[PDB]
Every structure is written in structure tokens, then in C-alpha cells.
Amino acid sequence: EDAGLVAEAEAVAAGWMLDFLCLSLCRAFRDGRSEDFRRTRNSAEAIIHGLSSLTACQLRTIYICQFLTRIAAGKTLDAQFENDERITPLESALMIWGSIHDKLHEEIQNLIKIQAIAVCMENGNFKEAEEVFERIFGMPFKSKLLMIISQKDTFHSFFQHFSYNHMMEKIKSYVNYVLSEKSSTFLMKAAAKVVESKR
Amino acid sequence: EDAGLVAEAEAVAAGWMLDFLCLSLCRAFRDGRSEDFRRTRNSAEAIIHGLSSLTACQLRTIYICQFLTRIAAGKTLDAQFENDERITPLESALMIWGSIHDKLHEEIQNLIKIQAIAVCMENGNFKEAEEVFERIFGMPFKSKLLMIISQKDTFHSFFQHFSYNHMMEKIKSYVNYVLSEKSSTFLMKAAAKVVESKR
Numbered sequence: 001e002d003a004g005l006v007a008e009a010e011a012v013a014a015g016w017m018l019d020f021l022c023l024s025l026c027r028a029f030r031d032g033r034s035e036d037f038r039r040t041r042n043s044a045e046a047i048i049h050g051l052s053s054l055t056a057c058q059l060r061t062i063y064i065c066q067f068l069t070r071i072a073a074g075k076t077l078d079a080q081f082e083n084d085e086r087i088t089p090l091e092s093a094l095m096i097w098g099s100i101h102d103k104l105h106e107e108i109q110n111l112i113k114i115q116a117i118a119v120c121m122e123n124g125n126f127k128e129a130e131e132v133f134e135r136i137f138g139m140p141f142k143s144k145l146l147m148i149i150s151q152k153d154t155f156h157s158f159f160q161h162f163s164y165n166h167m168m169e170k171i172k173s174y175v176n177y178v179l180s181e182k183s184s185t186f187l188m189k190a191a192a193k194v195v196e197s198k199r
Numbered sequence: 200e201d202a203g204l205v206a207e208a209e210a211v212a213a214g215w216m217l218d219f220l221c222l223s224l225c226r227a228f229r230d231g232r233s234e235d236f237r238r239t240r241n242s243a244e245a246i247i248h249g250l251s252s253l254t255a256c257q258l259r260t261i262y263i264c265q266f267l268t269r270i271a272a273g274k275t276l277d278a279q280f281e282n283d284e285r286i287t288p289l290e291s292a293l294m295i296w297g298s299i300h301d302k303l304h305e306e307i308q309n310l311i312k313i314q315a316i317a318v319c320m321e322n323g324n325f326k327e328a329e330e331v332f333e334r335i336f337g338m339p340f341k342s343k344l345l346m347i348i349s350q351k352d353t354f355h356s357f358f359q360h361f362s363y364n365h366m367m368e369k370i371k372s373y374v375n376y377v378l379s380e381k382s383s384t385f386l387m388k389a390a391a392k393v394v395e396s397k398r
């Protein structure tokens with residue numbers, strides 16, 4: 001047995017597992033299956049430790065997984081992430097997005113920027129909403145948005161175009177493109193072939 | 200797309216990933232690669248959540264993984280496991296082993312029974328050594344073993360036959376049999392084929 005060849009095969013399999021888990025995470029996110037998403041994300045983070053050197057495609061795959069994790073936790077009331085990063089999950093999703101269709105990219109970017117503030121207002125945390133606003137936008141629009149937060153004007157018309165549902169719809173359209181690109185990756189294709197043979 | 204067929208294919212892939220991770224864990228245990236073992240074990244525990252119904256073979260695979268985890272942590276000074284289970288890792292390995300070659304099975308069983316006491320003595324925790332003895336053996340041999348613990352006779356000749364190294368050697372021989380049985384499982388075989396094609 002050659003330890004070097006065994007290690008290379010383990011890295012090849014880690015690559016296959018990463019694509020399979022990204023495809024699973026994308027489907028769980030699209031379907032709103034939060035518990036399945038939570039389990040798949042735990043598996044993706046563990047499997048990613050099996051790769052020490054990533055290709056450009058593999059880097060894109062791990063950042064998509066990290067991005068969807070932060071979007072899925074967008075309205076969380078758990079302070080552990082913010083205690084570590086000193087920013088909210090939607091702000092972290094924005095940092096990832098900023099690296100990784102320029103029109104769709106810009107639309108998602110602006111929806112996340114506004115919703116990073118709006119989810120704080122929805123949760124009744126207006127001090128955090130103003131803190132998020134200062135980190136993102138620290139202009140008449142900026143003054144209007146500052147007045148909205150100041151007056152706790154959670155249902156201002158500004159949020160009809162920049163809504164939580166519009167952010168989720170645009171992100172899900174992007175997820176459908178990731179789903180198509182990865183739908184024929186090795187592991188899921190072999191697994192689907194096994195299932196189709198039993199019917 | 201059929202959610203039912205997608206879920207079935209995810210369970211098929213979880214089965215393949217479980218066998219691959221068991222094979223990896225066995226090799227890391229045999230090689231003494233503790234950090235690789237730690238990462239592989241984290242991946243196996245996450246992947247196992249993708250199966251809700253296990254076959255008899257899959258149950259054997261998860262219990263082998265759980266068993267080797269407790270053998271690998273046999274000399275641990277971390278109290279979190281004992282705080283939860285109120286037993287030591289070697290005692291938990293014994294519980295799993297008791298369910299999972301009757302001669303080799305009995306030899307491993309008795310080596311773990313003695314070493315569950317001996318690792319406590321090695322660590323200078325003789326109160327735990329006596330507590331482990333009472334849980335396992337609570338007879339002249341029992342009286343001799345009780346006197347050994349009482350006198351802190353860590354290097355008594357009794358431990359030459361029932362040594363830590365003999366326990367690890369017998370367990371590694373059993374691990375080599377698991378390694379052979381799983382060496383041609385789907386995922387590692389496909390991965391090895393990819394690596395062999397690049398040379």
C-alpha cells in the first residue's frame with residue numbers, strides 16, 4: 001500500500017463529496033427544508049477539512065455553501081456569530097457575495113444590504129439596525145434610510161421593492177443556476193442511476 | 200424533479216460516504232495519524248445523520264467507527280465524555296464490543312477490561328482505577344487486581360500479558376480485517392481508479 005496514493009484518493013473523494021453536499025444544500029435552501037440544510041451544512045464543513053489545496057471551482061463551491069449558510073441564518077436571534085465577527089449574518093453574506101451576471105449580482109447585493117438593516121427592525125433591535133446601517137453606508141437616500149430606522153418605520157414603502165421575499169426570490173434564482181451546473185456531478189449522478197434502476 | 204427520488208439518492212450517497220469514511224478512519228487508526236482520525240471521525244458523525252434507517256451492515260460500520268473513537272481516546276485526560284456517561288472511553292468501547300472470530304473477540308475484550316483500569320493508573324488517577332474495576336468486576340484474581348490498584352503497582356507482571364501495546368496490536372489485527380472487507384467499496388474504488396489513471 002502507498003500512503004501517498006491513499007491520500008490522493010481521499011482528496012479525490014473529498015472533491016466528489018463537496019459537490020454532492022453543495023447540491024444537497026442548494027436543494028434544501030430552495031425547498032425551505034431547514035433541518036436538512038442544517039445537517040448538510042455540518043457535513044459540508046467537516047468534509048471540506050479533507051481538502052488542503054482547492055481549485056478555483058472548489059473555492060467557488062465552498063463560498064456558495066458559506067454564503068447560503070449566512071442567508072439561511074439571516075433572521076437569527078443567536079448572538080454567537082456576532083459575538084465572534086462583530087457583524088450580523090447578512091453582513092457576512094454580503095462580504096462573501098462581494099467576491100463570488102452583473103445585473104443579478106448587483107440586485108442581490110442591494111437586497112442583502114437593505115435586508116441586513118430590515119431584519120434587525122423586524123426583530124425589534126433598532127440599535128443594531130443603526131449599527132448595521134453605519135457599517136454598510138457610513139446622501140439623501142442614506143438620510144432617508146437613517147430617518148426610517150430612527151422612527152422605527154419598519155413598513156415604509158422603501159421595503160416593498162427591497163423586501164425579504166424579493167431577496168429570497170433573487171437568491172433562489174441564482175441557486176437554480178448552481179443546481180443546474182452541479183446536477184450532473186459524479187456522486188449524485190451515480191446515486192440517481194442506482195435509484196432509477198430500482199423502479 | 201421528484202423530492203422522493205432526490206431523497207433516495209441522497210441516502211444511497213450517504214451509504215457510500217459512510218463506507219469511505221470508515222475505511223479512512225481504519226487506515227488513520229492503523230497508521231497512528233491522530234489528526235486525520237479526528238477529522239475523519241467528525242465527517243463520519245455528520246454523514247451518519249443522512250441515514251435514518253440502517254441495514255445490518257451499516258449498523259456494524261457505524262459501531263466500528265464509534266468503537267475505534269473510544270479506543271483512540273483511551274488515555275484521554277478530558278473529562279467531558281465521563282461527565283456525560285459516568286464511565287471512561289475504554290469502558291464505552293467494551294460496551295460496543297460486547298455487541299459487534301470468538302477467540303480474537305475474547306482476547307480483545309479481556310485486554311480492554313484490564314487496560315480500562317491500567318490507563319487510569321498510568322495517568323495517576325487510582326480512585327478512577329478502583330471505580331473502573333468496581334464497574335467491570337464488581338474471586339482471587341479480582342482480589343489480586345484490587346491489591347494491585349490499592350498498592351499503585353502499575354508495573355506488576357500482570358500487565359505484561361495484559362499490556363496497552365498488546366491491546367492495540369490485537370485491535371489493529373481486527374482493523375486489518377475491516378480494511379480488507381471495505382477496500383473495494385464504491386467510493387474508494389472509483390477514487391483509486393482516478394489516481395491510477397494520472398500515472
Ligand SMILES: CCN1N=C(C(F)(F)F)CC1=O
Pocket residue numbers: 028029030031032033034035037038071072073168
Ligand atoms: C424558505 C427559504 N429558507 N430556506 C432556508 C433553509 F434553511 F432551508 F436553507 C431558510 C430560509 O429562509
Ligand SMILES: CCN1N=C(C(F)(F)F)CC1=O
Pocket residue numbers: 041044045046048062063065066069
Ligand atoms: C466558515 C465556516 N463555514 N463552513 C461552511 C460550509 F458550509 F462551507 F461548510 C459554512 C460556514 O460558516
Ligand SMILES: CCN1N=C(C(F)(F)F)CC1=O
Pocket residue numbers: 041069070071072073074076081088089092
Ligand atoms: C450554522 C453555523 N454558522 N452560523 C453562521 C451564521 F453566520 F449564519 F450565523 C455561520 C456558521 O458557520
Ligand SMILES: CCN1N=C(C(F)(F)F)CC1=O
Pocket residue numbers: 227228229230231232233234236237270271272367
Ligand atoms: C498508534 C495507535 N493510535 N492511533 C490513534 C488514532 F487516533 F490515530 F486513531 C490513537 C492511537 O493510540
Ligand SMILES: CCN1N=C(C(F)(F)F)CC1=O
Pocket residue numbers: 240243244245247261262264265268
Ligand atoms: C455516538 C457519537 N459518535 N459517532 C461516531 C462516529 F464515528 F460513528 F461517527 C463516534 C461517536 O462517538
Ligand SMILES: CCN1N=C(C(F)(F)F)CC1=O
Pocket residue numbers: 240268269270271272273275280287288291
Ligand atoms: C471524539 C469525540 N468523542 N469522544 C469520545 C470518547 F469516548 F472517545 F472520548 C466519543 C466521542 O464521540
